[PDB]
Design a protein around this ligand. Structure first.
Ligand SMILES: C[C@@H]1O[C@@H](O[C@@H]2[C@@H](O[C@H]3O[C@H](CO)[C@H](O)[C@H](O)[C@H]3O)[C@@H](O)[C@@H](CO)O[C@H]2O)[C@@H](O)[C@H](O)[C@@H]1O
Ligand SMILES: [Ca+2]
Ligand SMILES: [Ca+2]
Ligand SMILES: [Ca+2]
Ligand SMILES: [Ca+2]
Length: 385
């Protein structure tokens, strides 16, 4: 196996309470792993609750951990960090978070859509935090200039964190052309990079017409014009082209390259999607690693038996160069779940799925040696970095 899935899944809290849906359904994690603790913890994650049929609960939420396994809501934090929309016309999705070393602050991005055709389109929005508890607009950010000035005291390391306290990073008049934004700070060129999937004004059924675009920014706040990446995905084991749905990118210093885990598909839409691995020296020009999937749905009846959904990763360096560990927080869905018993996070059959749970959404974990992963992907038992 390219990655070894951990048994069960991880417990993430979801704020919602809805009688027609099992609690604590969640997707699309984005994890930040640090060398040293930030506001008490070395692991920070943003994620969104989600259920079938209604997207209104899909609101950026934060947890922290000391281990990447057991997640807690920091003391004083109220999830979601971005409020529930006022109606089902609108929904949030697709969170991704970066640690900004210069400001010693987290930058949490997400996608907001007006889903009404002929509506206003969509936006990539941003809330920043200094303390891990309050997420919003820095008090030394000037909305007129869009400049985030570095704090010059502890008192300036504060945010406004009300319901309207976000930054619009990007706007588009189409609804679905900036899906799954993923941000990396390139410390060579000294620029923020954001990759997103362009599904036009169509979305989930756009399919093989999907393509990824990148944008550049000096600060992470104001972004330039998009340009298409090249070579993002390749052929699968049948020789069939893969198309993007959702993705996470990392710059990996130990590998001297950008690495991306892509939730992708060979058919008409992301049903049954798998993960593939793709890499790039520059962020622009990519090549898929092997023909084989990095992660696939589990067997019938498993919590991940429908599709693998958007996943986040960290390359943990080893003691030797080029010999690290791939750590993957993967989201997934189970099919055919209405009124059925489903697994808890320990893998025990203790949860009753509810009447409108057509599927169940959870976040779990998988891991492998980077070298062993590459050996499986490339069908090369002797690969070494
Ligand atoms: C309930 C329904 O939910 C959303 O549509 C889902 C769709 O959601 C994904 O794709 C749309 C674009 O088509 C957005 O990017 C979402 O952030 C994605 O999660 C898929 O799940 C398809 C699967 O068949 O089902 C649609 O109903 C939302 O766009 C709708 O407005 C509505 O809220
Ligand atoms: Ca999404
Ligand atoms: Ca990320
Ligand atoms: Ca091209
Ligand atoms: Ca190609």
């Amino acid at each position: 196996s390219a990655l070894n899935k951990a048994p069960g899944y991880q417990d993430f809290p979801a704020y919602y309470s809805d009688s027609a849906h099992a609690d604590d359904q969640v997707t699309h994690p984005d994890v930040v792993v640090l060398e040293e603790p930030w506001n008490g913890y070395r692991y920070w994650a943003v994620y969104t609750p989600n259920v079938m049929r209604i997207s209104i609960y899909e609101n950026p939420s934060i947890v922290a951990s000391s281990d990447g396994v057991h997640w807690v809501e920091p003391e004083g934090l109220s999830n979601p960090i971005e409020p529930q929309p006022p109606s089902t016309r609108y929904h949030n999705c697709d969170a991704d978070m970066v640690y900004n070393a210069e400001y010693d602050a987290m930058m949490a991005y997400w996608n907001w859509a007006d889903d009404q055709g002929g509506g206003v389109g969509a936006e990539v929005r941003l809330r920043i935090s200094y303390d891990g508890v309050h997420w919003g607009v820095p008090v030394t950010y000037d909305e007129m200039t869009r400049v985030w000035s570095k704090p010059t005291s502890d008192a300036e390391r504060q945010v406004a964190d009300g319901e309207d306290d976000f930054i619009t990073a990007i706007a588009s008049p189409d609804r679905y052309d900036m899906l799954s934004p993923t941000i990396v700070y390139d410390d060579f060129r000294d620029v923020f990079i954001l990759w997103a999937n362009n599904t036009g004004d169509v979305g989930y059924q756009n399919g093989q017409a999907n393509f990824v675009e990148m944008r550049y920014s000096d600060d992470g706040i104001t972004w330039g014009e998009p340009v298409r990446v090249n070579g993002f995905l390749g052929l699968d084991e049948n020789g069939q082209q893969l198309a993007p749905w959702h993705q996470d990118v990392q710059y990996v210093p130990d590998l001297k390259e950008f690495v991306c885990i892509s939730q992708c598909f060979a058919g008409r839409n992301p049903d049954g999607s798998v993960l593939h691995l793709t890499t790039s020296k520059d962020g622009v020009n990519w090549e898929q690693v092997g023909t084989k999937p990095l992660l696939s749905p589990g067997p019938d009846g498993s919590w991940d038996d429908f599709q693998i959904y958007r996943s986040s990763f960290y390359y943990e360096p080893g003691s030797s160069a080029g010999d690290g560990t791939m750590r993957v927080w993967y989201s997934a869905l189970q099919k055919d779940t209405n009124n059925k018993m489903v697994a808890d996070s320990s893998g025990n059959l203790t949860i009753q799925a509810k009447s409108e749970d057509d599927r169940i959404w959870r976040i779990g974990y998988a891991e492998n040696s980077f070298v062993e992963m590459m050996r499986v992907l490339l069908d090369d038992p002797g690969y070494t970095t």
